[PDB]
Design a protein around this ligand. Structure first.
Ligand SMILES: Cc1cn([C@H]2C[C@H](OP(=O)(O)O)[C@@H](COP(=O)(O)O)O2)c(=O)[nH]c1=O
Ligand SMILES: [Ca+2]
Length: 129
C-alpha cells in the first residue's frame, strides 16, 4: 500500500470526515473500525479524538487498501494518517473504536489493529471499561 495526499475540509464524527482528495471533496470512512455514533456512549469522545488528531496534523494522508475504494454510500474507504500516525489504529488503541467491518481483500492492517484492540482491552480503556 502507499500513502497519498489529502487535506481536511470538515470533521464529521469518530470514523468519518470530509477530505479533499485529488482536489475533490469526498467523505471518507475509516477502514476496519467502528466508532460509536455521536448519540451513543463514547460517541462524543470518539468524534473529539478524531477531530483533534486530524485538525492538529500538518500532513493528512490517505492510504487505500487493495480492494474497493468507495462504499455503497459513495464514501472513500481508507486508512488515514495524521503526521504519519494512523487514525484508525489510534482510535482502537484508545478504546474509542472496535475492530469491525473486516471484509476480505480490504484487510491489510487487520492484525495491526487487532493488536491495538487487545492492548486497549487489557487497559479497560473507554468502550472496554
Ligand atoms: C467500514 C465499511 C463500511 N461499509 C458499510 C457497511 C455498513 O452498511 P449498512 O449501512 O448497510 O449497515 C456501513 C456501516 O458504516 P457506518 O458504521 O458508517 O454506519 O458501511 C462497507 O461497505 N465497507 C466498509 O469497509
Ligand atoms: Ca460508526
Amino acid at each position: 500500500l502507499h500513502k497519498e495526499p489529502a487535506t481536511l475540509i470538515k470533521a464529521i464524527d469518530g470514523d468519518t470526515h470530509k477530505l479533499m482528495y485529488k482536489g475533490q471533496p469526498m467523505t471518507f470512512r475509516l477502514l476496519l473500525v467502528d466508532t460509536p455514533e455521536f448519540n451513543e456512549k463514547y460517541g462524543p469522545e470518539a468524534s473529539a479524538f478524531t477531530k483533534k488528531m486530524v485538525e492538529n496534523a500538518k500532513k493528512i494522508e490517505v492510504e487505500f487498501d487493495k480492494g474497493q475504494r468507495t462504499d455503497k454510500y459513495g464514501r472513500g474507504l481508507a486508512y488515514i494518517y495524521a503526521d504519519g500516525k494512523m487514525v484508525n489504529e489510534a482510535l482502537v488503541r484508545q478504546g474509542l473504536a472496535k475492530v469491525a467491518y473486516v471484509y476480505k481483500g480490504n484487510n491489510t492492517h487487520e492484525q495491526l489493529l487487532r493488536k491495538a484492540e487487545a492492548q486497549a482491552k487489557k487497559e479497560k480503556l473507554n468502550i472496554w471499561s
